[PDB]
Amino acid sequence: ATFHWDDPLLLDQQLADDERMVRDAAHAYAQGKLAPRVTEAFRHETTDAAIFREMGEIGLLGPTIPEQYGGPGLDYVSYGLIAREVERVDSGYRSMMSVQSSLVMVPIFEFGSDAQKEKYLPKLATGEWIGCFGLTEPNGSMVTRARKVPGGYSLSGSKMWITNSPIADVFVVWAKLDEDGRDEIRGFILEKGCKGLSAPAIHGKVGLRASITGEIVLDEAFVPEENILPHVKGLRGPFTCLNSARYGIAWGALGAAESCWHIARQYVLDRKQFGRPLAANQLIQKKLADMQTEITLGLQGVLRLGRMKDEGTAAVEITSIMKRNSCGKALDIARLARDMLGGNDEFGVARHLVNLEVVNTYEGTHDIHALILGRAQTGIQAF
Amino acid sequence: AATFHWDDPLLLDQQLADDERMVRDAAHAYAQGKLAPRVTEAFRHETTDAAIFREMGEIGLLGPTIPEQYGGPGLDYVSYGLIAREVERVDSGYRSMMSVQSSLVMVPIFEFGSDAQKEKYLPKLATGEWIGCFGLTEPSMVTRARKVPGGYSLSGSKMWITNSPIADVFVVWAKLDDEIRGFILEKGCKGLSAPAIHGKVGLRASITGEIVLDEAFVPEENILPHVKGLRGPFTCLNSARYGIAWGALGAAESCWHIARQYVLDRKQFGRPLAANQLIQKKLADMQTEITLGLQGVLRLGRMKDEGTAAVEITSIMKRNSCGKALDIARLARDMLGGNGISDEFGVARHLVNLEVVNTYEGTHDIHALILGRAQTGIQA
Amino acid sequence: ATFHWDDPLLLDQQLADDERMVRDAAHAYAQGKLAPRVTEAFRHETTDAAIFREMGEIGLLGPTIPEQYGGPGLDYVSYGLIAREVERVDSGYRSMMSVQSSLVMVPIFEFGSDAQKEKYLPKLATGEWIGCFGLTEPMVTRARKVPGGYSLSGSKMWITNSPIADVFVVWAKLDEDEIRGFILEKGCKGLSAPAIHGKVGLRASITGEIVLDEAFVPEENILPHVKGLRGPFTCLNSARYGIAWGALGAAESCWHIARQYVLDRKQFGRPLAANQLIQKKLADMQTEITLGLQGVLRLGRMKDEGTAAVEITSIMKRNSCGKALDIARLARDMLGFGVARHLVNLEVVNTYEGTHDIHALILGRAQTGIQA
Amino acid sequence: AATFHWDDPLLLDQQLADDERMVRDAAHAYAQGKLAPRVTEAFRHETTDAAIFREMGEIGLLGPTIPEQYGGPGLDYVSYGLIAREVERVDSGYRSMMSVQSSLVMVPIFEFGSDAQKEKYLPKLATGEWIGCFGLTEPMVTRARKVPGGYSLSGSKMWITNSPIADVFVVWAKLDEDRDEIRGFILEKGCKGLSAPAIHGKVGLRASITGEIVLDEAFVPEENILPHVKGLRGPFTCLNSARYGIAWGALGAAESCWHIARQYVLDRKQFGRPLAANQLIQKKLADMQTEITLGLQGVLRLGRMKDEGTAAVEITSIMKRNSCGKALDIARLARDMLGGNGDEFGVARHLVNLEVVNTYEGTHDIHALILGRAQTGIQA
Ligand SMILES: CC(C)n1c(S(=O)(=O)O)nc2ccccc21
Ligand SMILES: CC(C)n1c(S(=O)(=O)O)nc2ccccc21
Ligand SMILES: CC(C)n1c(S(=O)(=O)O)nc2ccccc21
Ligand SMILES: CC(C)n1c(S(=O)(=O)O)nc2ccccc21
């Protein structure tokens, strides 16, 4: 048997050709269209809404959404593969993509009415309408509220750090509704142009600059009864979305790690020092072996998670394992690779690195997935 | 949703065939039943009960990949892995004894032996009636075979040989002019001696000694006819490494299980230790690395069964398993308070064992360098 | 001009003649009398109280205690250099010494009556009397005021020296409710000190319990001049200072053994010293060791001036012990075996004060005014 | 009754002479007064502010150890270190501009130049009226050929700090005579065949201007070749001096990152509790403090030894490597403590600078190998 250094366990062979064609398409697309924009799209934080129709055309948005509602009907593994190819170029692009697929199309599909499903999904799937997701507030114990009024509801509040909001057409806002006996979290579809709805940008981000982020500002915004999500109440709504998004990020972070690895490898092959090429140094070799190992193992982890999700056998806690691992290992590898590079084109690594610094702290600095896993091992929440 | 299994998050148990699961279960019943009760005294006094060979052999745990034709159990590589894991869960020293039998003695006889050699040695090695060892290392090989009427005369020495003082069968690598050839010798050969080595830091539960050859006669029929060069020895080392890749994860799991149960049992300001944020991160890391390590060795095993596994993959897995296992053992050690009291310090036994296992192939991080060359095309 | 790999910053040239003599004296004792014993003593966890008389003789017990009471009247830097030389052989021996000097002699001297100071210090200095320190419990140990003195019930655990001690500095609670120091003597009825055996590390030191069953202490054997936390804490702080030095002696041994091992080894074609991974590990041991020593030296100089706040001991004890453990592990992972001993000792040393990084929390508080 | 100083636990302040403390104070006032207000926008848009050199020289911050005879302040090595620490505390890019003037231009001329060269160049470099650069690294091809009048120079230098704004160029080229050896030449701005195009779009050290040196048959008179050095000792003497100051500077950067993370966690509240109330945050602050404090003792001691001449070059390898390595770790630790994406992100600037600082001397651990060789007597 021959050894494939770039794919030691032959992931390629563990994929259905079905899944493999999706990867190839995603790769062709991201390399063809996103890679030549990335460097200056990142450097100048340039707003860019192209991705959506481009990805929509070739069926890369909401990949697990059935054909019935305009989705491509792909499986969890294929969603994984797509995320990996986009983030191989940049995490900012992957993020915009995560929002559309996991944070908008998933809740609508999962908790929407048939009318909501048949109305919104097709336009999201093709990228005609761009979505955003309204949960996080400036600080469940959320402030944004919906008061019941003649017709439907009246929403007031703010959401912050919302990817896609300054270019969104469909807003999936989460807010509290006082029903009868207690106050529960509910989901709302708002459309752009609705009065009371602002979404100004956030500028000056240190990382994920290639993605556009903003606020969602709601000042007595009216939502008719037909635009509340009927089939969910409470945490289950927002959490289903975050679980799906994290699964994709678990694949996507390994794409960026691979990019850093391949660059570090090619660099030390091309450069010379005190006689030999840099690749001849044992310290360099160890670093390259550590990168290969963690990526190879990480990929088996996410592949297996996706297989389990398609079977319906994967509990939510497994996502914590892979998301945390993929992100933390990708950050370590991005740093390892940074520290191998001289000379202030290779510096796609510095970009990946600052992206991953943000990705690793996006869900906070208290290692929330460690805590989910610790409680799942012991039954005890850490306080 | 689906149920979360903290102890088997990716449900390894369900990626196994039922014969593989049966082998695992039998290996578990044996180790826990027969090795766990011996291990504390065996280690402390550096005793090995050679009856372990006959016991493991009874159950069909020796040379698991050797076909039934030659008296083996005819199992696949995943099963070999599962067995090493259950044995090492108890003690690396016991796993080492088995690693020698199966990978260092039965494998080369099977791959490189004549029909006569395979028929004579393998059934007895498989049942553990005959105990084997592997003579490669020497304190650039000076042990030499010379042609003499009706065979060969071997002179030289091998050092740090596991099983050697209790071996019935010896696979020795020696130069024959000028290639490396493998020879099968039997205890009682005039010229052959196997003095024991005592006072080990780790792997105290396995026995180690030398092989000393002073014109030891080997008849013609006992030279391994179908191999010459480094490939003979290296095929064996590669097989051994594969099972250690699984085994080290067994010991890792024990350390993790001990550490978890310890922090569950203990208190600190009335809060149980598991309330501690730092403890949770540590348990999460232990769980993550074992879970991923296991997916790695399983996939390698499946590839080796289908013949699609290059030898470099073995370097990835053995290095990772041994490396992460040692870090886990050290993580679990430093979580423990006190100084020896309670079998929570069974972590101390696993720890010293893994410190030997992680340096047995030398201080040079050999596998990082194999993998480095494999990536770059450059010997470093 | 000339580089000293074993002393890059020439600590030798930053020490007074006074201090260099004391160092080389503790070195000669340790290497001549302790090194030949340690391997068997560790193996069999064998007790040997003769070590107390041998150190007393050369004046290594209570090195900062005034000549007036039998101590050698040395300075804090000298106490450190001694700890480092003793632990260079074995942490167990250093621990026996830490107890005599910082947990027994320091408190009698610091908080004891003139009567107490004269009766006990002289014989502790010479090692004729052996002392132990009863603070840690399995606080519930207490002194009932009774006729003539006090009756102590309770139990102390993991007490170094206790099964060979003559003098016990025991800490109990008494109502007036506060923490007081008591002095007990071997033989007193209701006082036993059974041995603890089976240790994984520090096997060369003898540890035991102190079991008090209505043990009598006369009124003259309470420490008059301290109450509350400051009592035990004064002792711990001095012991921790010595350990900050000591741990670096063990680290140095590990580094020297690892270095010599790789000089002597051939692998593939060359020596192990040819390997860059090995050289990087060696560069890391040298760095951390050299920096740690500048830290403990400076701390010592500050303590001798009276400019040293107690928080600085937390910095150095944490760092020396943490780095020493790391270096013992790095050394171990280079060896294909006194290192293995130093390693298990330091694994105990590093968790002796708990597994919750108490010194990190002390320093976090000191930086922020906010308790964790 | 001794009080603890969290920000100076070993009272470094009290280990300085008055001399040295006054220098530190002046460097501190200048950097905080004049550099801090510029740094954010200068970093962002890669501002060239050449006026900084005159500002620095005015107070005696350029070429600290150069004697008064030639316009230098005649300070000791410890003072050089204190200056570097205070400048880098604001930004590594400003420290870099200073390192070049002091260690890479004034040191080579003072140490290896003729009397004529020293009196001509040093006074104007000390005041900052003339700005220097140091041309070693290439994209050694750079050749000086003996002609009538002096020397013709051809070649290119790359990544040369200050070069687009330099008045004085210290360029190292190879010359054959009697054999083929590294010599030092001094060129000046406006010399025909000398150009120095600026590099822009840097990831780190964006506050320092860098560029090229392109020599197309550039004429250097006889009087402008450095006459008292040949071979590697020339450049090496400069690099070593530069490293000593970087060893102090990097620790200033670490201190800023530490001070920002501390203030951040005191200012922030989470869960009705200051962030500083968390155990992990306190460990991180303790590690930052420990490593900074210990590093400072090292570079203090190294400077003292250098002032009395007892310091071998290898000690500079230890401290430079430590300071830069620990600074990066501390910078990364603080960065990871900050939750957000877009002033306490002053840490982001220090971080990207330090990532360039830690790779400037090679993709691999050049100093570790110096210390390895030094410990063992064996080369890698
Ligand atoms: C897709 C974006 C918003 N995102 C990111 S990130 O911005 O790509 O890092 N991390 C997430 C975790 C959970 C849900 C969404 C997340
Ligand atoms: C089985 C024993 C000898 N062994 C060991 S060990 O002693 O169990 O660690 N490591 C090995 C690597 C290759 C081949 C054999 C090995
Ligand atoms: C001297 C022994 C008991 N000891 C030790 S140890 O057992 O040598 O590690 N660590 C200590 C910390 C504080 C006080 C005493 C300590
Ligand atoms: C002063 C600049 C050029 N510099 C730097 S840096 O750019 O400030 O990191 N590192 C150096 C190492 C040796 C010599 C000079 C160095």
Integer Cα distance of B203 and B355 in angstroms = 10
Closest CA to A125 of A102, A100, A91, A99: A100
Do C285 and C313 belong to one domain?
yes
C-alpha D38/C-alpha D47 separation (Å) is 9
Place of tokens 């509801």: A153
Of A39, A20, A21, A55, give the one whose Cα is nearest residue A89. Answer: A39
D357 within 8 A of D324, measured Cβ to Cβ: yes
CA distance from start to end of chain B: 50
Within 10 angstroms of residue D184's Cβ, the number of other Cβ atoms is 27
Closest residue to atom 7 of ligand 3, CA basis:
C349
Residue (of D176, D269, D188) closest to D230 by Cα position: D176
Instruction: Identify whether the C-beta of residue D350 lies closer than 8 Å to the C-beta of residue D274.
Output: no
Residue D187 marked in a binding site: no
Of A262, A321, A270, which Cα lies nearest the Cα of A291?
A: A262
Contact (Cβ atoms closer than 8 angstroms) between residue C307 and residue B329: no
Give burial (CB, 10 Å; 0-12/13-18/19+) of B144.
middle
Nearest C-alpha neighbor of D380 from the set A288, C260, A281, C330:
A281
Q: Tell which one of A163, A242, A243, A358 to mutate to probe ligand 1, the residue whose CB is within 8 A of the most ligand atoms.
A: A163
Measured in Å, residue A115 CA sits from the centre of ligand 1 at 28
Tokens of B16: 């196994």
CA dist D184 → B365, C244, C317, D236 (Å): 43, 49, 50, 12
- SS3 for C200? coil
d(CA D241, CA D104): 8
Q: Which atom of ligand 2 is nearest to the CA of B206?
A: 7
CA distance linking residue D348 with residue A206, whole number of Å: 8
* Count of CB atoms situated within 10 Å of the CB of B256: 26
Contact D297, C287 (CB under 8 A): no
CB D362 within 8 A of CB D343: no
Between vectors from CA D304 to CA D331 and to CA D356, what angle results, nearest 5°?
A: 25
Residue closest via CA to ligand 4's atom 4 equals: D96
d(CA C26, CA C83): 8
Q: After which residues is chain C broken (C to N over 2.5 A)?
A: 138, 176, 336
> In whole angstroms, what is the distance from residue D374 CA to residue D313 CA?
11
**Peptide-bond breaks in chain A following residues (C–N over 2.5 A):** 139, 344
Please tell me the residue having the least CA distance from ligand 4 atom 9. Answer: D357
D261: nearest Cα among D159, D152, D334: D334
Distance CA A349, CA A265 (A): 12
For the CA atoms of D185, D190, D194, D196, the dihedral, rounded to the nearest 10 degrees, stands at 100
> Which of the 8 DSSP states describes residue A201?
B
Alpha helices in chain A (DSSP H): 11-14, 17-29, 35-43, 50-57, 76-89, 91-98, 106-111, 114-125, 236-270, 282-311, 317-338, 348-359, 368-378
Residue D21 token pair: 């403390």
Instruction: Enumerate residues 6+ apart whose C-beta is below 8 A from C61.
Output: C52, C55, C71, C97, C100, C101, C105, C124, C125, C126, C127
Cα–Cα distance measured from residue A332 to residue A289, given in angstroms and rounded to the nearest whole number: 13
Among D232, D274, D252, CA closest to D331: D252
Q: Under a CB-based contact definition with an 8 Å cutoff, are residues A195 and A252 in contact? A: no
* Strand B169-176 versus strand B144-148 pairing type: parallel
Give the minimum alpha-carbon distance from A284 to chain C in angstroms, rounded to a whole number. Answer: 10
Burial D241-256 (b: 16+ CB within 10 A, else e): bbbbbbbbbbbbbbbb
The CA distance from C29 to C36, in Å, is 11
Tell me the one-letter amino acid at D201.
Answer: G
Residue D190 maps to which CATH number? 2.40.110.10
Residue nearest to atom 2 of ligand 3 (CA): C95
Q: Which letter does DSSP use for residue C34 in this model?
A: I
**B100 within ligand 2 shell (Cβ under 6 A):** yes
- Domain of residue A50, residue span: 1-130
Q: Which residues make Cβ contacts (< 8 Å) with residue A281, sequence separation at least 6?
A: A268, A273, B380, C276, D364
Check if C236 has its Cβ closer than 6 Å to any atom of ligand 3.
Answer: yes
Do the beta carbons of residue A223 and residue A190 sit within 8 Å? yes
How many C-beta atoms lie closer than 10 Å to residue D176's C-beta?
Answer: 11
Q: Which of B161, B196, B228 is the last residue of a domain?
A: B228
Q: Among residues D188, D212, D230, which one ends one of the domains?
A: D230
Burial of B259 (0-12, 13-18, 19+ CB in 10 A): buried
In chain A, whose CA is at the least distance from the CA of D353? A344
Q: Identify the CA nearest to D373 among candidates D305, D311, D317.
A: D317
Instruction: Using the 3D structure, point to which of B82, B107, B131 is the last residue of a domain.
Output: B131
What is the number of the ligand closest to the CA of A205? 1
Angstrom distance (rounded) from CA B262 to CA A310: 36
* Helix, strand, coil tally for chain D in percent (to 5): 55, 15, 30
CA distances to A346, C8, C9, C286, D59 from C4, in Å = 40, 5, 8, 11, 37
| Residue pair C82/C22 in contact by the 8 Å Cβ criterion | yes
Residue in C closest to A282 by C-alpha: C276
Decide: C83 and C72 in contact? Cβ < 8 Å.
no
Q: Are C336 and B360 within 8 A, CB to CB?
A: yes
Which residues from chain B sit within 8 angstroms of residue D278, using beta carbons? Answer: 277
> To 5 degrees, how large is the angle CA C69–CA C70–CA C74?
100
Are residues B340 and B235 both part of a single domain?
yes
Residue pairs spanning C and D at CB distance below 8 A: 182
Which residue in chain B is spatially nearest to A240 when comparing CA positions?
Answer: B1
Q: Round to whole Å and give the CA distance between D365 and A283.
A: 8
Distance between CA atoms of residues C13 and C6, nearest Å? 13
Minimal Cβ distance to B201: which of C268, C340, C356: C340
Count other Cβ atoms within 10 Å, centred on residue B67: 14
Cα-Cα-Cα-Cα dihedral of A322, A324, A325, A326, to 10°?
Answer: 80
Helix or strand (DSSP H, E) at D161 = strand D150-161
Of B161, B244, B311, B354, the one to substitute when testing ligand 2's pocket (max ligand atoms within 8 A of C-beta) is: B244
In the set D58, D111, D129, D361, the catalytic residue is D361
Domain at C333, CATH number: 1.20.140.10
Ligand 3 midpoint to CA C93 (Å): 11
Radius of gyration for chain D, computed over Cα atoms and rounded to the nearest angstrom: 21
Contact: C336, B363; criterion CB under 8 Å: yes
Note whether B20 and A334 are within 8 A (CB). Answer: no
Let me know whether A177 and A42 are in one domain: no
Q: B333: which 2 tokens?
A: 């050690």
The number of angstroms, rounded, from the C-alpha of D179 to the middle of its chain's C-alpha atoms is: 33
> C209 near C193, Cβ under 8 Å?
yes
Residue C149 in 3-state DSSP?
strand
Q: Whose CA is nearest to atom 11 of ligand 4?
A: D360
Is there a catalytic annotation at residue D361?
Answer: yes
Q: Is the CB of C349 under 6 A from ligand 3?
A: yes
Q: Buried (b) or exposed (e) across C293-321, using 16+ Cβ within 10 A? A: bbbbbbbbbbbeeeebbbbbbbbbbbbbb
CA distance A174 to chain C (A): 35
Report the greatest alpha carbon distance in chain C. 80
Would you say C225 and C184 are in contact if contact means Cβ atoms under 8 Å apart?
A: no
The answer to whether residues C251 and C162 belong to one domain is: no
Asked if B239 and B185 sit in the same domain, the reply is no
Neighbours of A27 (CB within 10 A): 18
Distance from CA of D184 to the nearest CA of B (A): 36
Three-point CA angle D45, D50, D55, nearest 5°: 120
Same domain, C259 and C298: yes
- Cβ of C146: how many Cβ atoms within 10 Å? 13
Say yes or no: CB of residue A189 within 6 Å of ligand 1: no
Q: What is the Cα–Cα distance from B248 to B81, expressed in whole angstroms?
A: 10
Task: Say how many Å lie between the CA of residue A213 and the centre of ligand 1.
Answer: 11
In angstroms, rounded to a whole number, what is the distance separating the alpha carbons of residues C315 and D6?
11
Q: Is the dihedral of CA A55, A59, A64, A66 positive or negative?
A: positive
Name the one residue in this structure whose structure tokens are 């207000």: D37
Q: Rounded to an integer, what is the distance from CA C246 to the centroid of its chain?
A: 7
Residues of C with CB under 8 A from a CB of A: 275-277, 280
**Residues in CB range of A193: below 8 A, 6 or more apart:** none
- Asked if D379 and D373 touch (Cβ cutoff 8 Å), the reply is yes
D10 and C295 Cβ atoms separated by less than 8 Å: yes
Strand pairing category for C167-174 and C131-134? parallel
Please identify which residue in the block is written with the tokens 């920000």.
D7
SS3 C99: helix
CB of D145 closer than 8 Å to CB of D152: yes
Residues C346-371: b if buried by 16+ CB within 10 A, e if exposed: bbbbbbbbebbbebbbbbbbbbbebe
Nearest 5°: the CA angle B118, B119, B122 is: 60
Please list every residue in chain C whose beta carbon sits closer than 8 Å to the beta carbon of residue A286.
277
What single letter denotes the amino acid at residue A244?
S
Count how many domains chain D has.
3
Q: Nearest ligand to the C-alpha of residue A95?
A: 1
* Whether residue D86 sits in one domain with residue D137: no
Residues 6+ apart with CB under 8 A from A214: A162, A164, A165, A166, A199, A200, A201, A202
Residue B252 and residue B344 in one domain: yes
SS in 3 state form for chain B? CCCCCCCCCCCHHHCCCHHHHHHHHHHHHHHHHHHHHHHHHHHHHCCCCCHHHHHHHHHCCCCCCCCHHHCCCCCCHHHHHHHHHHHHHHCHHHHHHHHHHHHHHHHHHHHHCCHHHHHHHHHHHHHCCCCEEEECCCCCCCCEEEEECCEEEEEEEEEEEECHHHCCEEEEEEEECCEEEEEEEECCCCCEECCEECCCCCCCCCCEEEEEEEEEEEEHHHECCCCCCCHHHHHHHHHHHHHHHHHHHHHHHHHHHHHHHHHHHCEECCEEHHHCHHHHHHHHHHHHHHHHHHHHHHHHHHHHHHCCCCHHHHHHHHHHHHHHHHHHHHHHHHHCCCCCCCHHHHHHHHHHHHHHHCCCCCCCCHHHHHHHHHHHCCCC
Same domain, A123 and A139: no
Resolution for this PDB entry, in angstroms: 2.2
Tell me which of B3, B8, B10, B335 to substitute to probe the interface with A (most A C-beta atoms closer than 10 Å): B10
Atom of ligand 3 nearest to the CA of C317: 12
Same domain, D370 and D294: yes
Report yes or no: A76 and A306 within 8 Å, Cβ to Cβ. yes
Spatial neighbors of C352 by CB under 8 A, at least 6 apart, are: none
Identify all chain A residues contacting D199, using CB atoms and an 8 Å cutoff.
344
A176 neighbors A185 (Cβ within 8 angstroms): yes
Q: How far is CA D301 from the centre of its chain?
A: 19
Radius of gyration of chain A (CA): 21
How far B363 CA lies from chain C's nearest CA (Å)? 5
Q: Which residues contact C308 (CB under 8 A, 6 or more apart)?
A: C299, C302, D2
> In chain D, whose CA is at the least distance from the CA of C317?
D290
Alpha carbons A347 and A345: distance in angstroms, whole number? 5
The three-state DSSP-derived secondary structure of C160-198 is ECHHHCCEEEEEEEECCCEEEEEEEECCCCCEECCEECC
For residue B7, the chain A residue with the least C-alpha distance is: A377
Q: Report the C-alpha gap between C328 and C254 in whole angstroms.
A: 6
Helices D366-376 and C276-305, axial angle in degrees (round to 10): 80
Residue B378 Cα, gap to closest chain A Cα (Å): 6
Measured CA distances, A372 to A236, A324, A379, B286, C341 (Å): 16, 11, 10, 14, 38
Closest CA to B61 of B14, B13, B25, B10: B25
Same domain membership, residue C140 and residue C84: no
Q: Do the Cβ atoms of A104 and A131 come closer than 8 Å? A: yes
DSSP type of residue A130? P
Going by the DSSP 8-state scheme, the letter that residue D197 receives in this structure is: P
Return the bridge partners of D133, or none: D169
For the record, the structure tokens of C298 come out as 């400076």
**Would you say the C-alpha torsion B50, B56, B60, B62 has a positive or negative sign?**
negative
Q: In sequence order, what are the residues at sequence separation of 6 or more whose Cβ sits closer than 8 angstroms to the Cβ of residue C9?
A: C290, C293, C294, D298, D301, D302, D305, D315
CA of C10 to the centre of ligand 3 (A): 29
- What is the distance between the alpha carbons of residues D37 and D50, in angstroms, rounded to a whole number? 16
CATH, residue B24: 1.10.540.10
Contact present, D282 and D359 (Cβ < 8 Å): no
Same domain, A249 and A366: yes
Is residue A241 within 8 Å of A196, Cβ to Cβ? Answer: no
Q: Which ligand is nearest to the CA of D246?
A: 4
